[PDB]
Ligand binder design. Sequence first.
Ligand code: HEM
Ligand code: HEM
Ligand code: BML
Ligand code: BML
Lengths: 137, 137
Amino acid sequence: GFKQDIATIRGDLRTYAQDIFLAFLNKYPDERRYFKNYVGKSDQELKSMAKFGDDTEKVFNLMMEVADRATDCVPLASDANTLVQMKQHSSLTTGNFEKLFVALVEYMRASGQSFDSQSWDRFGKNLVSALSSAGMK
Amino acid sequence: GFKQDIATIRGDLRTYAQDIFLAFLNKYPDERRYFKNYVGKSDQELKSMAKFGDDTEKVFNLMMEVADRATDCVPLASDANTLVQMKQHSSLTTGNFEKLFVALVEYMRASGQSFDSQSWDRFGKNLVSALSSAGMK
Ligand code: HEM
Ligand code: HEM
Ligand SMILES: Oc1ccc(Br)cc1
Ligand SMILES: Oc1ccc(Br)cc1
């Protein structure tokens, strides 16, 4: 279930974080614009930038922390608040997050690893709702 | 995105090259008049024509290099000059290339693989513009 998925992802965070982020960018190529440094680089090329592996892991580490602190896939208001107030997220809207979760769930469904994909869909939905409440456009 | 798509195509080039060129010929059957002995044949007949596979592979080998040498989907002027000055391209105009890229983009959108189709559309347009600049009518 959801709890085990957090363990699965944490167990090999570098791989999962990189592969899910790439699935996001590949499904929604216009989102690459937010990451100027990743423009004009292939999937295999990106893994060689110290920043890429390190920065993607940091993103998915926090995602896992928000996921683990949730109750029944409902994130804490304080965690939603953190995500909105973050300076690196100043120009984002809830749609950016919606797209990430659509790509994340699609990745899980396509994988050979057994994920509670329905739960991640619901978590994504609840997070987006909590993000709007914390003032994200 | 675009740079990954190049790697994707290169990973199974002959298959992609034949399937995209076939999509082109089937969308624009009168375009066969630039080629020798393609008329009167089904897709499978063409894929068993030794020259068809060899030549179509060579077209896409070069197209991938032109894409790879590009910056932000803008090809090198010298790459465009080569395509204009090639003896095998003496009967061509920019509309021939426009048609090829319409078909390629349509193929990418229809495929189950995550191509950045909009970028290929831009690449096609920028290449046509560069062909024009290099003297193609
Ligand atoms: C639940 C989902 C998300 C979490 C947990 C999260 C978390 C983070 C974290 C921890 C960082 C700092 C990483 C570091 O530099 O150490 C960061 C930065 C950043 N975030 Fe997010 N984020 C999320 C969603 C998104 C989305 C959907 C976008 C837009 C596509 C986005 C855009 C950015 C950008 C552009 C940076 C700066 C990093 C860079 O560009 O190099 N984030 N985020
Ligand atoms: C970016 C697009 C294109 C690239 C990179 C390209 C490149 C090439 C290359 C490398 C060859 C040599 C093939 C060989 O001899 O093995 C070739 C030949 C040829 N090209 Fe193109 N070409 C492009 C577009 C087109 C288009 C749109 C047409 C016609 C609608 C066309 C018509 C031909 C013909 C008739 C030949 C020689 C005979 C044949 O290969 O069947 N090309 N081209
Ligand atoms: O650096 C980043 C990696 C992944 C996301 Br999602 C956002 C920022
Ligand atoms: O021989 C050729 C194969 C494919 C194209 Br497109 C053009 C020429």
